[PDB]
Amino acid sequence: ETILEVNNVPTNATSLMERLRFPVSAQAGKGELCAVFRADPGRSGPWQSTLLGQLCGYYTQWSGSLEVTFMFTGSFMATGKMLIAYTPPGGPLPKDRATAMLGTHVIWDFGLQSSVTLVIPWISNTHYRAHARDGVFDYYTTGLVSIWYQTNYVVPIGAPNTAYIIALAAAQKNFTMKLCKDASDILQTGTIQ
């Protein structure tokens, strides 16, 4: 397990901390969206920060998928339900909570859960990249994961308003990396005496 950044909005130095966790405060609580992302390990964004993406940056046959984990930091008296849904590849993200409810999904809660481990399936149908030359094909797509406010964030009078959900990342013993290729980076400064 390695913690995963999703709220990767800040780009300064002091505010570097909250790249890791995101708020679940109680302003709107019926049908809006929290955050979405992709499932591409070694391209950009979230998985680039964990160790799985770092190891994916050394091969060509990757998955960047499978189980994740969410740990809640509500004080002790916070209740509420979150909707977690996964969209298979080659599909649009649902425009409402009802559409996302269909397919595959799970309803979280804050009573006594403090954890949840959704798992991603693995499917291979199309051709990743069959470029005989570069600059002619730009056809890439992947499934997505979304978080929906099911119910508003209940709280007794006296407890704080904003909490923070953290996210984890891991895999299991099904998928493997392949085709050892040389990694290309910019982790240099030229002046290395």
Binding site: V24, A26, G29, K30, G31, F72, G74, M77, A78, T79, G80, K81, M82, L83, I84, A85, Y86, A98, A100, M101, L102, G103, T104, H105, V106, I107, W108, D109, F110, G111, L112, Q113, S114, S115, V116, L118, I147, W148, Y149, Q150, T151, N152, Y153, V154, V155, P156, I157, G158, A163, I165
Partner: protein, 245 residues
């Protein structure tokens, strides 16, 4: 089934943890059900799955000025709701149900609800002077939506039936004091062996807050109410119309 399929979220607004609250009476899906008989040249069939999972329609909010809400069946099984892909084609329908109601609140709130299922719940409308003996039964009221509809006069149940004697039907007492769970099972209830996909609406679900919701200022002023259902043993068949292909 399980807890996942398309909808995988298992955490509502309070984002609760520490197991679940069900309190089972029966022994883990007590067997299948019957097929009955008929008296005509018609015969139905079964759709098996894709209706065997769970469903969670929209959450209605409880406030101090609340009066209560009701639902009609199988109105929410149709396109008026999440489903609607195998509900408006066929002609015959029959199913059991596994209805589960989950509420949530802190330890500082007070109030108590009441769930009840009334078979053949035919509303007598608001009435009060709208003189109608038999001209045209309404469709804009008896089928409000998957959201339900707030009651007008709960004491007379908006039909003239007293609320006091409601507990004759199966019922549970949603009490904010101790628990938050409500699991009920409703078998098929109809005079005819099989029902239609039309204005022969089956039982209706009633939820009335008897003990009013109250609290102190500064806390959360609204308590959400979740509704889940599971259509045990459903069927779908029957169709014949104009030009076919």
């Amino acid at each position: 089934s399980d807890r996942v399929a398309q909808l995988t979220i298992g955490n509502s607004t309070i984002t609760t943890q520490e197991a679940a609250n069900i309190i089972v009476g029966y022994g883990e899906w007590p067997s299948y059900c019957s097929d009955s008989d008929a008296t005509a040249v018609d015969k139905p069939t079964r759709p098996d799955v894709s209706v065997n999972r769970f469903y969670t329609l929209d959450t209605k909010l409880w406030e101090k000025s609340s009066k209560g809400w009701y639902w009609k069946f199988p109105d929410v099984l149709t396109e008026t709701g999440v489903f609607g892909q195998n509900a408006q084609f066929h002609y015959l329908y029959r199913s059991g149900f596994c209805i589960h109601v989950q509420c949530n609140a802190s330890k500082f709130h007070q109030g108590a609800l009441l769930v009840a299922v009334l078979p053949e719940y035919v509303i007598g409308s608001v009435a009060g002077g709208t003189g109608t003996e038999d001209t045209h039964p309404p469709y804009k009221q008896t089928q409000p939506g998957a959201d339900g509809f707030e009651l007008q006069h709960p004491y007379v149940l908006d039909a003239g039936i007293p609320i006091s004697q409601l507990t004759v039907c199966p019922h549970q007492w949603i009490n904010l004091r101790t628990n938050n769970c409500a699991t009920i099972i409703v078998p098929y209830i109809n005079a005819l062996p099989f029902d239609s996909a039309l204005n022969h609406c089956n039982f209706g679900l009633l939820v009335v807050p008897i003990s009013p919701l109250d609290y102190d200022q500064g806390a959360t002023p609204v308590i959400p109410i979740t509704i889940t259902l599971a259509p045990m043993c459903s069927e779908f068949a029957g169709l014949r119309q104009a030009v076919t292909q």
